[PDB]
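Hi W., the dihydrogenphosphate ion complex you wanted:
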Amino acid sequence: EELKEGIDAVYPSLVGTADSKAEGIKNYFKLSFTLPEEQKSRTVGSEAPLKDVAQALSSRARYELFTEKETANPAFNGEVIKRYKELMEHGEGIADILRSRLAKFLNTKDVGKRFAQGTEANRWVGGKLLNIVEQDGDTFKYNEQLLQTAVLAGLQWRLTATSNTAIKDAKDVAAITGIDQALLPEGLVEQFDTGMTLTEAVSSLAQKIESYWGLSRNPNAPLGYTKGIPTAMAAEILAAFVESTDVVENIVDMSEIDPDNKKTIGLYTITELDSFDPINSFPTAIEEAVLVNPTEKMFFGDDIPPVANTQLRNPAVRNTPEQKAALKAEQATEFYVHTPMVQFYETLGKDRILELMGAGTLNKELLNDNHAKSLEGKNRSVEDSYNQLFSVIEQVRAQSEDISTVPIHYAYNMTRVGRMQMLGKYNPQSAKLVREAILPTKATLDLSNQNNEDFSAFQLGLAQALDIKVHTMTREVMSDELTKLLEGNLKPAIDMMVEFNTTGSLPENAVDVLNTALGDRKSFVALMALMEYSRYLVAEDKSAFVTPLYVEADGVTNGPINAMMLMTGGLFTPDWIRNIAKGGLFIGSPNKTMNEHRSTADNNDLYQASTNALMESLGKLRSNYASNMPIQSQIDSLLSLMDLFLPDINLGENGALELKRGIAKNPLTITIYGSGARGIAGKLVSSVTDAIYERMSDVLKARAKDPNISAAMAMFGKQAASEAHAEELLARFLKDMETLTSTVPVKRKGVLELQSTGTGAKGKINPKTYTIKGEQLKALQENMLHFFVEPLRNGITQTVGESLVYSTEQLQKATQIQSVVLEDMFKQRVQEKLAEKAKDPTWKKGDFLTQKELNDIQASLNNLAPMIETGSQTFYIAGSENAEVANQVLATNLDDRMRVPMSIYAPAQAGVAGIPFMTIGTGDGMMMQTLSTMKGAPKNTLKIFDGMNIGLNDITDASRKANEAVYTSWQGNPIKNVYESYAKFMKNVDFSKLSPEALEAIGKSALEYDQRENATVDDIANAASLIERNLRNIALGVDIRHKVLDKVNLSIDQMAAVGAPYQNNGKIDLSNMTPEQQADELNKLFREELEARKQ
DNA sequence: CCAAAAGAAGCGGAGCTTC
Ligand SMILES: O=P([O-])(O)O
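Structure:
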């Protein structure tokens, strides 16, 4: 334990004594950290890190010598060295600002003088930096090594933080602002997606600083300092970047939006460098020079990423051996630049790509204000995508004269729900633009004869890319549809691309040609198809055509189908057999493919079936109120309004109601993820208003093209057949909007009743500022909920099966109950330890617990089975990082601002997360994992969770293995896994130890709404034990269903497109049988097996 | 609705209070 002497020898002049017992000023930096047994950072021991790294970066020779490496990244050339020299000079500026802020802090309120006299200011939430200062005459100054190293981390963070940020969805934004996701104003999510909250910025910053300091945390040091000191430094650096304008701080006032919320939220945006800044070609020089084992870097050639030991943001969960194997397999895949697309992108240019794939140049006065904000969000995603791609290309180009020959590797990690996610924000897996320029797919085809198997594969790839639903028709039929398109509407674009793959030039109207030829088929992969077809046309040796064009073996209604196969636990029913066939599970039809099923057996997929069940359910609701004209009218107005702006809603001339599968796609999807009815109503309403806000921009653009244009023939001109026909459409719109915002349906004892809101909506509409706000959005929502979503949910349940719904409810209840106990017990164990610490003179409130004390508290929860094991995957549903456990500030900057709450890794309630976790995890998660590690695992693919991109040369075998992988995941039993964990929990849990708050939460999950109020600890305990039994029975059934189904002859083509189904070779033949007959035989096998168990 | 959480700032030196 000579560590004390060691760290003191490195920082012998820091203020205070490294002894938590000493009476005077104690130095918590020396108490909190220790030198690593093996060097982690090259700045440790350095007296002037900035000067030393600046010199290291001054020349390639000096760099190589500093990083003790014979060679250096070729991208580190002259122009780049020059940018870094300038950035280093800027680091001196940030350091100078930091030194002055400290000086100010020391002067104000005589803090420094008081600190010198013994006031323990180095323990205050805003004075932890005083732990890295040194006495200087009558004042104090930063230890230059710690300060400059932190500024270097600040520089690296400034360069690449933005590209490592997570994407914020509605849910996220709602959490931050506290505003109901359904009411989130327009563009709010965009403003918050392009920025970083305080927690977000400081957190990532503190991580970098601590890593660059290169020390290790002392397990017996208070988190208040081990985590607080690096965080305090980060807060000061963020403040310094605000002063230097490297970062813009924007305090968003929620009261301006929702006048009831008083939250004011800080948003931090890093100032972007010019897209053409040389530093973009090599933004990680500092990182790679400072750290022994750099984190941020590209992996070229044979430089492969290491394999992550723990699940993403879940340190407590280790990646299983099979998961690690999968990660290794995916990281070994070599990706390569497709020069043709890169050249095409570069020639079209950023502006035209935005015009073609974004919103082009939008002038804020020809567009609705809300619509505008949406278009701006669209442009951003594509633009950042474009710039990221070319910064990558700039670095690849330096690795060789032929960029198409430089192998690129990507790091991956397993997420909380078992998905193999490629690290980074804009990469082949996450960004469509990048996916068509950097591919792992490659094949050499013989396209000299259009009758070759190779040409057919090529056709399949082209058709799928061009939006031909290749999995719904046979290969032969798709071949004809593709030909028709290539020879017809696409011909003009094809000709242009031919010219491009000859002279390298594009017409001035390239965007119009493409846009016209593609229509709604437009996408980045569609551009790849046009490019690849045109390259083939001009190809010299069509006998050996090399192309990365791919075919995606794509899951058909994957999530829902997986849930149905994994969690249906009763006897087999004919409706289930017919419905599961829609997902590629064919019983008694050897070698049957999805292509044949859709063309000769059933043309309706699971979405269509849901939509059709919705129509039935909707019809029933109308009958129950057949006599109530007010209701009938409210329903007609809702349907009228949707048919007015949504493609999937058609109202026939004679009133015939038609709904297209599209309307059910997301609702079904998220309903399988545990979503509630209100959330679905909210999304449907948003898709309506978005169409409306856009139609307002269609109007503004109508008046500019002709001032004397009737509102009717300006808003519905293109959607009408005349001016009178447009007048009646406008009548509908105005009618519906007023009725749907002034009147809303209410649930009063099972019956629906209309009530005025008093907040009706009407008046001269201004196509410029038109907006449906709060109370009116709420009304549209209430109408959507009861007249459309309610029946939709009934339709969904009827389609996926009530048995599956029952299973998901028990799963949700079990995992929720368990998470409540984990959360509560953990907080109490913490509370007891703190009350125990308050009796310790060395300890101070604000200091928290040590990592060892936290590790102990977590270990003590093991008997409650916090982890769910499957044998190949581990799930920690309750796991999280929240501020509710410590409930205090960790640190602030020296201006008493940027107060970062102390977050701790600890269990928190699960809510409904148990459903997504287990369904995604044992479903598509396990399948991809299996696909990456199974015998003969397909090579050179790009896996995207529920679909996989395959090179045209291996489409048949890779897709058959994919279907085999699906079959393998269908042998899983997530309920059984939950059961095993829950049963251990039930035999060690003590409900009497739970706070009244926790015990009530449990009552909600385990008890009927009519038994909470007076529920005794012994009551809810017996109710919880009932769920264990429910789970055990569900799991037993699932286990039998899987065994029995495996005895029958099955053709599996869930990962459809190619027509290569996996055959399980079941011995029992169920061919020439109706679904009713098959269900009878399967149930016979079931009842038979049931006895085997009983005996 | 899962994928990662999540207010700011005076006064005083924590944590209550006001917007
Ligand atoms: O083109 P897909 O969606 O049928 O695979």
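Residues 558-582+1072-1095 of chain A form a domain with the Single alpha-helices involved in coiled-coils or other helix-helix interfaces fold (CATH 6.10.250.1860).

W.
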